């Protein structure tokens, strides 16, 4: 049985710009027992029927995780626009996997969480950018932040206790499935 508890029930989660990857391998994955957490505000899948997940096998499964805002969870999906999906975490158009999200104001309100506002270009799918070099609007990067037109590219989220649910922290975990010409490492109950 796959260690889904250690991903979803983890005490700490990454900033979306510094999203973490965990590898699920050599285990049986009953996704329907993962569902039963009614805390899930979001549970959508792409390229696979969620009923049919119990009978599929994959060569490699990854579990990426991050903290974004309620009104940004919609951006964690294929072929989407936004500051998160273009500078923090991008998904391929042919994405095969699932996106799960839940409200985490209980654990992440008053938490040091960041996202990337400025970038020279959009992320390639599954790219990660941990750079903290100053961004020059019209200027060259690496300029002095005290000067004008020069900003730090990473901004804190500010998950105050009075904001609307659209602004509160939500923890997202993205399971991505792939099966190539390689042996299987993850299988459902029906196809063990």
């Amino acid at each position, epitope marked *: 049985l796959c260690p889904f508890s250690q991903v979803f029930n983890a005490t700490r989660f990454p900033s979306v710009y510094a999203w973490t990857r965990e590898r699920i391998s050599n285990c049986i994955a009953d996704y329907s027992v993962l*569902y039963n957490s009614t805390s*899930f*505000s*979001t*549970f*959508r*899948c*792409y*390229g*696979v*029927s*969620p009923t049919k997940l119990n009978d599929l096998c994959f060569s490699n499964v990854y579990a990426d995780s991050m903290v974004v805002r*309620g*009104d940004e*969870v*919609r951006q964690i*999906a*294929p*072929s*989407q626009t936004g500051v998160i999906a273009d500078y923090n975490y991008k998904l391929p*158009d*042919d*994405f095969t996997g*699932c996106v799960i*999200a839940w409200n985490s104001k209980a654990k992440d309100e008053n938490g040091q969480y960041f996202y990337r506002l400025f970038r020279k270009s959009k992320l390639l799918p599954f790219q990660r950018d941990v750079s903290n070099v100053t961004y020059g609007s019209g200027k060259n990067d690496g300029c002095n932040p005290s000067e004008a037109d020069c900003y730090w590219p990473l901004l804190k989220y500010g998950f105050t206790s009075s904001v609307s*649910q659209d602004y509160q922290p*939500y923890r997202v975990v993205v399971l991505s499935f792939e099966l190539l010409n390689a042996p299987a490492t993850v299988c459902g109950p029906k196809r063990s």
Partner: nanobody
Amino acid sequence: QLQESGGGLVQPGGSLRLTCAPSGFTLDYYAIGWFRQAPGKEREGVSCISSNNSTYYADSVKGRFTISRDNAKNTVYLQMNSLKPEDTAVYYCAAEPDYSGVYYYTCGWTDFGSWGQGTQVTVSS
């Protein structure tokens, strides 16, 4: 932008048809959901349909509510039949781009960025 019509006052067991109407875009490559918000309580997802024509329904409405898209008439209607008092709330429709097909295990407000203003639905006698 989404325009919503069809709500109103209905006796227990009656019928209602909620309409959701897009302006300025086509619902062909979009996913549309119907959401209700009772007084105080949080926006619950009632029924959603993706471009896949794959659908979701809340467990409490499963046998009684029906979502449908008219990709030619650019309308998405929720048929609300066998109405219960528990069904009284403000109903919003929502729309999200869905260029690749979505499959919902659940449907939530966290899944849509465009919303309507709401229609009031009341089931009483």
